[PDB]
């Protein structure tokens, strides 16, 4: 099916496909409300599409406001910043064993970061993907996976 048609279908079904609940991973997180097949569109990380050069000026801005940064790198040139304006995708925890995966798609010239399902996800499951955060010097992970790196970084 066409990536535009699939994206329209995803934006139509997103509000009733997933939910946010109290999470045993941490705080609140994204849970599955209807069995999601593999590779299908789970959710867009929708937000403010900005250029990369403006990230820091925003980040420091949030650093001046004590508001956490909700930014995902679209590519070397664009970023979806969801700190001030976003969607439910801001509540997707991470797991070392993800049933989901992030991919950038091009619809009518604009890039969309869509989390798709790495596998057939069933109702009730908490949605998690690989943030692929670079190794820092340390955030402990509680994803519960047996392969868990003990640290995102």
């Amino acid at each position: 099916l066409p990536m535009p048609m699939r994206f329209r279908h995803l934006k139509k079904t997103s509000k009733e496909a997933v939910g946010v609940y109290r999470s045993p991973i941490h705080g609140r997180g994204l849970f599955c409300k209807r069995n999601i097949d593999a590779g299908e569109m789970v959710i867009e990380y929708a937000g403010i599409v900005i250029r990369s050069i403006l990230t820091d000026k925003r980040e420091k801005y949030y650093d001046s406001k004590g508001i956490g940064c909700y930014m995902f790198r679209i590519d070397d040139s664009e970023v979806v910043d969801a700190t001030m304006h976003g969607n439910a995708a801001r509540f997707i925890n991470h797991s070392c064993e993800p049933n989901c995966y992030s991919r950038v798609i091009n619809i009518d010239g604009q890039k969309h970061i869509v989390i798709f399902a790495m596998r057939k996800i069933y109702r009730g499951e908490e949605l998690t993907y690989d943030y692929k955060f670079p190794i820092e010097d340390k955030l402990p992970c509680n994803c519960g996976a047996k392969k868990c790196r003990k640290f995102l970084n």
Partner: protein, 257 residues
């Protein structure tokens, strides 16, 4: 191989523009859509004094171009003066912008300004006081349907000490009328004329032989002259690199020139 440039004259190099930067070769004007961006010319100055112009063809209120010079390391997505290696003017009121700092040590700007840009950097002696060797990198690639060359550029300099190039300066003119000195403190490293666009700004760079209010100095050089100078210099660079790798030995005359 060769560094042959897809240009009839020394123009704004397409190799050093942002993907959000549009050009119209009817006037070689440059325009953008969102925020600011930066483009540069084909040539680049290393010594001597020279001069060019920018002609503005459209400046709505939400349209503010910036015009000036910038060394390499200049991120072409930034508004030409956001870093310490770029010095420009904001085309709302004549205001010198460098290190993102705005200074009103300047005249006033007009919507239909044909602005002249004079700039004098010292010889490579006072620039380097050492060897200005130009050992070049050359890598062959075949992008989707055409052949191209890659070279290694300079790295972000952490220079925080002020060592101005001796007797270097920048002067700004409005239609030849002296708008005054913009920056006397000029850091080392080659510079090139650059243009920053805000949302839908229409401006264009222009060389000397078709000028409107040119200075009558016998030492300053138009854009085209330094352009073919640098082109021939890089031709000799290719010559010397292929010599080095291909034939044993090298030799150059009494160093001074």
């Amino acid at each position: 191989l060769y560094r042959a440039c897809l240009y009839e004259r020394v123009l704004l190099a397409l190799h050093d523009r942002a993907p959000q930067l549009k050009i119209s070769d009817d006037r070689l004007t440059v325009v953008g859509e969102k925020g600011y961006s930066m483009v540069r010319a084909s040539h680049g100055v290393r010594k001597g004094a020279w001069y060019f112009e920018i002609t503005v063809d459209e400046m709505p209120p939400d349209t503010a171009a910036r015009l000036g010079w910038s060394q390499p390391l200049g991120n072409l997505q930034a508004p030409l003066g956001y870093d310490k290696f770029s010095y420009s003017w904001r085309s709302k009121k004549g205001t010198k912008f460098h290190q993102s700092i705005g200074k009103h040590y300047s005249s006033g700007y007009g919507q239909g300004d044909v602005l002249g840009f004079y700039i004098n950097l010292p010889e490579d002696t006072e620039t380097a006081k050492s060897l200005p060797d130009t050992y070049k990198d050359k890598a062959l690639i075949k992008f989707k349907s055409y052949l191209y060359f890659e070279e290694k550029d300079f790295v972000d300099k952490a220079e925080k000490s002020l060592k101005q190039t001796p007797h270097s300066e920048i002067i700004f003119y409005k239609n030849g009328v002296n708008q005054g000195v913009a920056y006397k403190d000029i850091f080392e490293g080659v510079y090139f004329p650059a243009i920053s666009l805000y949302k839908s700004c229409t401006v264009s760079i222009n060389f000397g032989p078709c000028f409107k209010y040119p200075p009558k100095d016998l030492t300053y050089r138009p854009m085209s002259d330094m352009g073919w100078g640098a082109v021939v210099e890089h031709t000799l660079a290719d010559v010397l690199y292929h010599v080095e790798t291909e034939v044993d030995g090298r030799r150059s005359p009494p160093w001074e020139p």
